[PDB]
From a paper:
Thioredoxins (TRXs) are small oxidoreductases that contribute, in most living organisms, to the control of cellular redox homeostasis. Indeed, they reduce disulfide bonds on numerous proteins involved in several processes, including antioxidant defense mechanisms, photosynthetic carbon metabolism, and protein folding. In addition, TRXs have been suggested to control two additional Cys-based post-translational modifications, namely S-glutathionylation and S-nitrosylation, by catalyzing the reduction of glutathione-mixed disulfides (–SSGs) and S-nitrosothiols (–SNOs), respectively. The redox activity of TRXs relies on the presence of two Cys residues in the conserved Trp-Cys-(Gly/Pro)-Pro-Cys (WC(G/P)PC) active site motif.
Numbering used by the authors: 1 to 111
The structure:
C-alpha cells in the first residue's frame, strides 16, 4: 500500500516510534478496520500521501483487528482515526474520513 508500513505487533509499533524519534521525522498512523466503510474510502488517499511525502513523513497502518493492544493503548473509539507522533509521543490527531483535513494534517506536520 504505497509507502505505508503495516504494523503487525506491539514490538514493531515500538520500534517504528523509536526510529521516528531517532530520525526526527514525524509519523502519521492510520487506525483501520476492514468492516469500517469510512476507513476503506480514505485508504487510497492515505496511500497517495504516503508516496507524495516519502522522505518527510513516516506512514503507518494499524489494523485494530491485528493489533488490538496498540489500538487499546491509543484510545481509539471511531474510525478512521489518524495519529501524529513526534519524538515518541502523540502530538496531533484527526478522526473522520475528510479528504481535505487529512491532506492538511500531513502538510502541517511535514513542513
Amino acid at each position: 500500500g504505497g509507502s505505508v508500513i503495516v504494523i503487525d505487533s506491539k514490538a514493531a509499533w515500538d520500534a517504528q516510534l523509536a526510529k521516528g524519534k531517532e530520525e526526527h521525522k514525524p509519523i502519521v498512523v492510520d487506525f483501520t478496520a476492514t468492516w469500517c466503510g469510512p476507513s476503506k474510502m480514505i485508504a487510497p488517499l492515505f496511500e497517495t500521501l504516503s508516496n507524495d511525502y516519502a522522505g518527510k513523513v513516516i506512514f503507518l497502518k494499524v489494523d485494530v483487528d491485528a493489533v488490538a493492544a496498540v489500538a487499546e493503548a491509543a484510545g481509539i473509539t471511531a474510525m478512521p482515526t489518524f495519529h501524529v507522533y513526534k519524538d515518541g509521543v502523540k502530538a496531533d490527531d484527526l478522526v473522520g474520513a475528510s479528504q481535505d483535513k487529512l491532506k492538511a494534517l500531513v502538510a502541517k506536520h511535514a513542513a
